[PDB]
Amino acid sequence: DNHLSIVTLEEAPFVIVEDIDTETCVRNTVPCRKFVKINNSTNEGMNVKKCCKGFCIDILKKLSRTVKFTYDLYLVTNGKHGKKVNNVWNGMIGEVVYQRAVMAVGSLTINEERSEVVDFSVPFVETGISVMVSRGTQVTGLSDKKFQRPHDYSPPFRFGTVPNGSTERNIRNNYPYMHQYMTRFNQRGVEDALVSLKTGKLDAFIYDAAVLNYKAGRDEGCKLVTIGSGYIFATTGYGIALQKGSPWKRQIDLALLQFVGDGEMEELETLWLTGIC
Amino acid sequence: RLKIVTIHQEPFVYVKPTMSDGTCKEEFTVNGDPVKKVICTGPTVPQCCYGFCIDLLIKLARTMNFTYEVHLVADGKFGTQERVNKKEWNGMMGELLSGQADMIVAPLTINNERAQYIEFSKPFKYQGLTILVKKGTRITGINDPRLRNPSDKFIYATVKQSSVDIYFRRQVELSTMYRHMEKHNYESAAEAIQAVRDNKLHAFIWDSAVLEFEASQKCDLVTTGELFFRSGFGIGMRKDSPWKQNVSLSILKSHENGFMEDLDKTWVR
Ligand SMILES: N[C@H](Cc1cc(C(=O)O)nn1-c1ccc(CCCF)cc1)C(=O)O
C-alpha cells in the first residue's frame, strides 16, 4: 500500500501532544494514538487518541502531500528516541527495526549505530553536541580544555548533561575523564538544567544542539546562550528513519532537499524554532 | 583502484607544485601533526594535493581498504546541468556520471538537483551561504539596497556552474539578482576572491566554509557574519554504488569520533 504505519515521539517543539476536542483534532494537528498501560504489572492497555503538532509534524504533512502517502501516526511507549539494550532496540528506532513502523518522524538524531539497522533520510535540521551557558561565560564547545581537564582551572567548571542518552554515551567514549568528572552534575531533565544554569548552580549544560538552540531562542530575558554553530561537536542532523532498504527513502530524500532549497524548511524553522533571543 | 575527482578549493583542497623529483614537500602543522599529501593530476601535470578533503579521502581509503588516484576536474567546475534536446552535467558532476571519476571528494554541496542523478553520503561538513566583501565596504547582507536593486556601480557575483548558480537561477524571487549575477560570475572562487581584493568585484556570494576562512587569513577581506542559507557538503558517488553505505557510516563515525573536529581545527579554524 501507500498507507504507512509511522511512529513518533513527544519532544516540543518538534512534536507536541494534545488531547482531542467536537471530539476530534483541530487544524495544525493530526491524529496520533498512544497505547496507555492499565498498570505497571500488566501488558494490558488502551489505545488513546491524541493530537500531534509541531515542526516534525509539519514535515510529515509536506512529505505526505509531496510523496503521496497516507499514514497512521502513533507515539512510542517503550523508550524514547532509540537505545540498543543488550542488543535489543527500544524507542522509535525499535519500532522501525522490528517492523511495527515503516517510518519514524521526530527529533531523531542520525548516528552510525542506528544507521546500521535503519536507513536515514537526509537530515532536515542540524544538531550535534552543543553547550549552553549564562551570557558572559567563555567556552569554545565540548572539546574545550575547561571540559577535558576541568581541574586545570580553579575553581573547576561545574557542568553536566542529562544522563542515559546519546550525549553521555558519546562523552563517555571520547573523553573518559570528562565523563567521570561531570557525573556529579547529572541533571534530571532539560528544564532542571536550565534552572540550575540560571540559579548559578551550574556553569554549563552539555546537550543536543537543536534543543539548546530552541531553549536559548525563547529564554526569558535572553540570559542563556549557546556556543556558535561552528563549535558544535559531532555535527549531524535529525532525520527520518526508514526500514532497511526502504523504497520510500529516495523520494523522501528528494522531497526534503526540495523543501530546503525552495524556502519551505526555513519557514517551518521560523514557524517553530526561532525565538526572541 | 577508485578514480577520485576533486577541485581546487582552499581550505578543503590545496594544489601545489611537486618537487623536482615529482614528490611532495614534507610538512608538519604548527601543532606537530604531519601534513598528508597525495599526488593529483590536473590541467596534464602531476601536482600535490592536501587539505580537509584529502585528509578525509585518506581516512576513507584506510577505513574501507581501497586504493585511489586523484585528479582535478578537467573543466574546473563543480557541476550544473546544461542543455545540449538532451542534457548533460558539467564539472565534477559530469565526470562522475560519465565514469571519468568513481567518487567526488570535494566541498560538493548536497542539493535536490544533483541528488536526482547521483548518491550523496551523509554530510561531512555543515555550513551555508554568506557574502564576502573588501574591508571598507559596508553592506548588510543578502537583503541590502545594492544587492536587491543591482546596478553597475556595485558588482556582485558567484562562481559559474556551481550550486550557488543553481540556487539563484531556480527561484523566481531571485530573478533580479540572478540577472545581474549571471553577467558577472567567475570561473572559480579563487579568481572572485582575488577580484574582491583587487576591487574589481564588490561582493562574492559563496560557501561560508570557504569565505569565513578567507577572511580569517586575509585582513583586507570580511564577510557579512551571517548565513542566509544552510547547506552541507557530501561525498558523491554514482547511483546504487556499492561504496555508498560504508562511506556514510564512515562519515558518521568520523563526526562522532572527534575526527571531523580535528580536521576543522587543522584546516578551517
Ligand atoms: N535527538 C536525540 C539525541 C539528543 C538527546 C541527547 C541525550 O538525551 O543525551 N543528546 N542528543 C544528541 C547526542 C549526540 C549527537 C551527536 C553524536 C551522535 F550523533 C546529537 C544529539 C536522539 O535521537 O537520541
Q: What is the DSSP string of A196-211?
A: HHHTTS-SEEEEEHHH
Of all residues in chain B, what percent are helix, strand and coil, respectively (each to 5)? Answer: 35, 25, 40
Contact state of A235 with B269 under an 8 Å Cβ cutoff: no
All structural domains of chain A, each given as residue ranges with its CATH number in brackets, are 1-127+235-273 (3.40.190.10), 128-234 (3.40.190.10)
Is A170 near chain B, with CB under 8 Å? Answer: yes
Compute the nearest-CA separation of B137 from chain A (Å): 25
Q: How far is Cα B243 from Cα B251, in angstroms, rounded to an integer?
A: 12
Contact state of B258 with A233 under an 8 Å Cβ cutoff: yes
* Exposed / middle / buried, residue A246 (Cβ in 10 Å: 0-12, 13-18, 19+): middle
> Which secondary structure element, helix H or strand E, spans residue B175, and what is its range?
helix B175-182
* Integer CA distances (angstroms), B215 to A44, A143, A226, B202, in order: 63, 24, 23, 15
Chain B partners of A121 at a C-beta cutoff of 8 Å? none
Which residues of chain B come before a gap where C and the next N are over 2.5 Å apart?
43, 84
Compute the nearest-CA separation of B194 from chain A (Å): 25
Chain B partners of A174 at a C-beta cutoff of 8 Å? 256-258
For residues B3 and B18, state if they share a domain: yes
For residues B154 and B240, state if they share a domain: no
**A107: number of Cβ within 10 Å:** 25
For residues B218 and B248, state if they share a domain: no
For residues B248 and B168, state if they share a domain: no
For residues B100 and B134, state if they share a domain: no
Residues of B within the annotated binding site for glycine?
107, 109, 114, 163, 207
Q: How far is Cα A59 from Cα B65, in angstroms, rounded to an integer?
A: 38
Q: How far is Cα A270 from Cα A263, in angstroms, rounded to an integer?
A: 11
Quick check: helix, strand or coil at residue B4?
strand
For residues B107 and B201, state if they share a domain: no
For residues B81 and B139, state if they share a domain: no
- Our CA dihedral for A191, A192, A197, A198, rounded to 10 degrees, sits at 70
State the resolution, in angstroms.
2.0
Q: How far is Cα B121 from Cα A253, in angstroms, rounded to an integer?
A: 12
Quick check: helix, strand or coil at residue B216?
helix
For residues B9 and B109, state if they share a domain: yes
Kindly identify which residue of chain A lies nearest to residue B123, measuring between CA atoms.
Answer: A236
CB contacts under 8 A, B 102-131 vs A, are: 110-112, 115-116, 120, 122-123, 125-126
**A35: number of Cβ within 10 Å:** 14
Chain A partners of B264 at a C-beta cutoff of 8 Å? 230
For residues B51 and B78, state if they share a domain: yes
Are B25 and B48 in contact by the 8 Å Cβ rule? The answer is: yes
B59 is in which domain, residue-wise?
1-126+235-269
Pairing assessment for the beta strands A70-75 and A45-53 based on DSSP bridges: unpaired
Kindly identify which residue of chain B lies nearest to residue A235, measuring between CA atoms.
Answer: B255
Pairing assessment for the beta strands B203-207 and B68-72 based on DSSP bridges: unpaired
Q: How far is Cα A248 from Cα B269, in angstroms, rounded to an integer?
A: 38
Q: How far is Cα B255 from Cα B226, in angstroms, rounded to an integer?
A: 24
Are B12 and B209 in contact by the 8 Å Cβ rule? The answer is: yes
**DSSP 8-class letter at B190:** H
Which candidate, A218, A233, A205, A232, places its Cα nearest to that of A276? A218
Disruptive mutation site among B162, B229, B248, B256 for chain A (greatest number of A CBs within 10 Å):
B256
Sequence-separated (6 or more) residues with CB below 8 Å from residue A34 = A17, A47, A48, A50, A74, A75, A77
Contact state of B111 with A257 under an 8 Å Cβ cutoff: yes
Domain of B148: which CATH number? 3.40.190.10
The residue assigned the cell 586545570 is A152
The residue assigned the cell 517551518 is A268
Q: How was this structure determined?
A: X-ray
Give one word for A91, left, alpha or beta, with left for phi > 0 and alpha for psi -120 to 50: left
Residue nearest to atom 20 of ligand 1 (CA): A128
For residues B137 and B5, state if they share a domain: no
For residues B98 and B219, state if they share a domain: no
Query: What total of structural domains would you count in chain B?
Result: 2
Are B47 and B68 in contact by the 8 Å Cβ rule? The answer is: no
Pairing assessment for the beta strands B2-6 and B68-72 based on DSSP bridges: parallel
Does the CA dihedral B54-B58-B61-B63 come out positive or negative? negative
For residues B107 and B165, state if they share a domain: no
Is A110 near chain B, with CB under 8 Å? Answer: yes
